[PDB]
Design a protein around this ligand. Structure first.
Ligand SMILES: *[C@@H]1O[C@H](CO)[C@@H](O[C@@H]2O[C@H](CO)[C@@H](O[C@@H]3O[C@H](CO)[C@@H](O)[C@H](O)[C@@H]3O)[C@H](O)[C@H]2NC(C)=O)[C@H](O)[C@H]1NC(C)=O
Ligand SMILES: *[C@@H]1O[C@H](CO)[C@@H](O[C@@H]2O[C@H](CO)[C@@H](O)[C@H](O)[C@H]2NC(C)=O)[C@H](O)[C@H]1NC(C)=O
Ligand SMILES: *[C@@H]1O[C@H](CO)[C@@H](O[C@@H]2O[C@H](CO)[C@@H](O)[C@H](O)[C@H]2NC(C)=O)[C@H](O)[C@H]1NC(C)=O
Ligand SMILES: *[C@@H]1O[C@H](CO)[C@@H](O)[C@H](O)[C@H]1NC(C)=O
Ligand SMILES: *[C@@H]1O[C@H](CO)[C@@H](O)[C@H](O)[C@H]1NC(C)=O
Ligand SMILES: *[C@@H]1O[C@H](CO)[C@@H](O)[C@H](O)[C@H]1NC(C)=O
Ligand SMILES: *[C@@H]1O[C@H](CO)[C@@H](O)[C@H](O)[C@H]1NC(C)=O
Lengths: 439, 129, 48, 48, 96
């Protein structure tokens, strides 16, 4: 400190920046037919497998529990998106897509059943087109297995060996309808997702809450709106680059496809038998010795299923943890602005929005970003009049024109000291700057 | 096929399955594909006397021609061929015990195949402007 | 020797699969602990 | 052991995934500590 | 493990049987550098970890927020600082 004052860099200009965050909330519902996987079509194997008793019943029961946990999680996420949402029946997204100079046309799909499954937004369309194996991607791949195609899709070979991915209980088009409705709920009255006020005023009050004077905000409203929709366009364009969110989404599909491929490759291991093929064993040996070989394959394949099941349980614990975080962000970043600093992404978080994504949700976090700075001398408090202390609210005291003035901490704008920007103290602390002439 | 040299007659994959051959007598060349294998997803209600069957990803023409003929009524749903349930996807239910996937549900009075829509928006008729 | 060694191979591979399944379970708790520690850095140390 | 094929490959693959989760977690914790930190270049802890 | 010592460390026997603990991608020295930086970010301007105000004022306002009048806090500032660094010493000694 020089006298009572410290050197601080205060922003003199700013912009809004957008940051993407994919959170996984779901995973491919893998289902295994233990009998078809272990024994294929061979009666001599099904006989021996029946003497192992409940092992296939245990594998099926654990996978049915795991898939029920995924279904319950997907319902709880959809319930969280729809919670409290109230829309006007006059709302028509074919005409109603921008307000207060901010453009939402890309974030909003078809609203209401008259448009059918087209409720996916342009943003969600652009995100889904870069991921082949979404829910509809799996349904189309399995539909092609009886198409007679010369292409040998590993998904068909997996399904014919009893390894298959089922669709989720809610289609991604329904979830995209819920994220569309939750988005338009902030745009128009009654503003049920935006604290009951217009979206631009909510943005303005959130920026003011960072220590920016309202006087710059309500004159720069056009510059703030254009910064906001430029940030949204930068998020959309950012998926064409090697985007970390898109990389995370593809890693969900890739890790699933890798695990299923490893489980299929377990059928070709010999496990110390004369062959990995039941056709070869049963065409080389009679029952007394064929039993000894087939029993080695049954133990190998049942051990591989128990290993895969234990990995699947472990992974779905992480999917439940991720879904609980995504519901917390929908509640405390999108539908409201909880007073938690780095929870809703990094930096000076203004506001957040949500869109559907393959196996999860994609959040857009918008943050106040300083562009340029002024170094200034600031006082954290003043001692004034009859040694009454004052401290600045979300700001600093500064000398301007040899007079004490206040400024917000996030934007340099000298304004007069008043009870609107001050905390009073009946005694001033030590090392508060003496200013007997104030007030 | 053009890849078979004079000493070669069998086409193998990376796992050692045979996937094609050249016939030693006729020199004709064939690809080999596995015969279809799959499950039936049966929906059952305790108050019912029958099952609603879903053949996932199969068209009903394929089920009837290549798997089995049946007397039950059938239709091609999004999920595959559905037997013994009425096609009522225009109808919707807010709760469902027999969840089939992709927002489809089996409901029982016969069985109905209907859409599952567990959540609604609250609507008001107030002006947006 | 093959018949004996194959019992040792099955024993040792079974032990590795058990240790792997335990390690996956433990690391899920380590991730949960790290998520809490980041939340405390943000909401107790850098802010209140 | 080579006739058990992919068993050792699966053990190595799961442990490499686990160790990659730990590494990614340690980076996210360090990022959380460093987030927003601005220091004066005049700062020297031998005197201050 | 290759130092030729007569000591039979279990970590060496584990490593020779293919069981080994690798170092983390960031050393604990780097992490202790990051916790040091995050700590001094509250000591001095711009106070980037202490809400942009001096640490003692942040402590005083936090205590005031509990329902303690500002008058006793800014009068007893020396006693509060002494209680604070005594608490820190009590943690350090409490590790023994
Ligand atoms: C304050 O109230 C006025 C009047 O209700 C609002 O002005 C309207 O704002 C929209 C932008 O959200 C303007 O749309 C623009 O139209 C041109 C074509 O004319 C197009 O090129 C632009 O891309 C944009 O879509 C609209 O013209 C404008 N209407 C009038 C009569 O001015 C204003 O948005 C409200 N809010 C604020 C913060 O000013
Ligand atoms: C099937 O292909 C074989 C191999 O090319 C044919 O056998 C050869 O035919 C030519 C022409 O008559 C002879 O010069 C060769 O000596 C034959 N043997 C071999 C081993 O090359 C055979 O004729 C073909 N048969 C049919 C019905 O297409
Ligand atoms: C199953 O029932 C649905 C609902 O009645 C049928 O869908 C309608 O089909 C007609 C003729 O193509 C269209 O005009 C409607 O727009 C469709 N409605 C919807 C909600 O998509 C469907 O065609 C029936 N399918 C079968 C195989 O019977
Ligand atoms: C703030 O920054 C933008 C982008 O550099 C610029 O267009 C604008 O004129 C600047 N305003 C001020 C007051 O410096
Ligand atoms: C399915 O088959 C049709 C016809 O061959 C083709 O147009 C379509 O692209 C295929 N889709 C997939 C996912 O294989
Ligand atoms: C949802 O809306 C439809 C159409 O108005 C109605 O049939 C159904 O009963 C509603 N369900 C709930 C839970 O509100
Ligand atoms: C809105 O709904 C209520 C209840 O049906 C009705 O009294 C009112 O006239 C309606 N207003 C409009 C504009 O539809």
């Amino acid at each position: 400190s020089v006298g009572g004052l410290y050197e601080i860099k205060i922003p003199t200009n700013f912009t809004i920046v957008g940051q993407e965050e994919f959170i996984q909330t779901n995973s491919p519902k893998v289902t295994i037919d233990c009998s078809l996987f272990v024994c294929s079509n061979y009666a001599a194997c099904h006989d021996l497998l029946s003497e192992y008793g409940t092992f296939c019943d245990n594998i099926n029961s654990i996978l049915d529990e795991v898939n029920g946990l995924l279904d319950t999680t997907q319902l709880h996420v959809a319930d969280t998106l729809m919670q409290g949402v109230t829309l006007s029946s006059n709302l028509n997204t074919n005409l109603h897509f921008d307000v207060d100079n901010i453009n939402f046309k890309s974030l909003v799909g078809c609203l209401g059943p008259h448009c059918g499954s087209s409720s996916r937004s342009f943003f969600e369309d652009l995100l889904f087109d870069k991921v082949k194996l979404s829910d509809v991607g799996f349904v189309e791949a399995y539909n092609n297995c009886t198409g007679g195609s010369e292409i040998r899709d590993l998904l068909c070979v997996q399904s014919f060996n009893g390894i298959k991915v089922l669709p989720p209980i809610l289609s991604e088009s329904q979830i995209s309808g819920y994220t569309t409705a939750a988005t338009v709920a902030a745009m128009f009255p009654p503003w049920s997702a935006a604290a009951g006020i217009p979206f631009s005023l909510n943005v303005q009050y959130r920026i003011n809450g960072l220590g920016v004077t309202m006087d710059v905000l309500n004159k720069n409203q056009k510059l703030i709106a254009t910064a906001f929709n430029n940030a949204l366009l930068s998020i959309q364009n950012g998926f064409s680059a090697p985007n970390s969110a898109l990389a995370k989404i593809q890693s969900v599909v890739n890790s699933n496809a890798q695990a299923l491929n490893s489980l299929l490759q377990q059928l070709f291991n010999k496990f110390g038998a004369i062959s990995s093929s039941l056709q070869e064993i049963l065409s080389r040996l009679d029952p007394p010795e064929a039993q000894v070989q087939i029993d080695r394959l049954i133990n190998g394949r049942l051990t591989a299923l128990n290993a895969y099941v234990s990995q699947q349980l472990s992974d779905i614990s992480l999917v439940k943890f991720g879904a609980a975080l995504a519901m917390e962000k929908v509640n405390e970043c999108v539908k409201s602005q909880s007073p938690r600093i780095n929870f809703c992404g990094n930096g000076n978080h203004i506001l957040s929005l949500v869109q559907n994504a393959p196996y999860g949700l994609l959040f857009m976090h918008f943050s106040y970003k300083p562009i340029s700075f002024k170094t200034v001398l600031v006082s954290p408090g003043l001692c004034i009049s009859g040694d009454v202390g004052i401290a600045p609210k979300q700001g600093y005291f500064i000398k301007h024109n040899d007079h004490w003035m206040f400024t917000g901490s996030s934007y340099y704008y000298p304004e007069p000291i008043s009870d609107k920007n001050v905390v009073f103290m009946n005694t001033c602390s030590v090392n508060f700057t003496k200013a007997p002439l104030v007030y | 096929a053009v890849y078979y040299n004079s000493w070669q007659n069998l086409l193998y994959d990376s796992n050692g399955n045979i996937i094609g051959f050249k016939d030693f007598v006729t020199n004709k060349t064939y690809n080999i594909f596995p015969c279809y294998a799959g499950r039936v997803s049966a929906a059952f209600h305790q108050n019912a006397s029958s099952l609603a069957l879903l053949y996932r990803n199969l068209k009903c023409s394929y089920v009837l021609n290549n798997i089995s003929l049946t007397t039950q009524p059938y239709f091609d749903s999004y999920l595959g061929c559905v037997f013994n349930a009425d096609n009522l996807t225009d109808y919707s239910v807010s709760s469902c015990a027999l969840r089939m996937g992709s927002g489809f549900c089996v409901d029982y009075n016969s069985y109905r195949f209907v859409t599952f829509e567990p959540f609604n928006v609250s609507f008001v008729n107030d002006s947006i402007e």
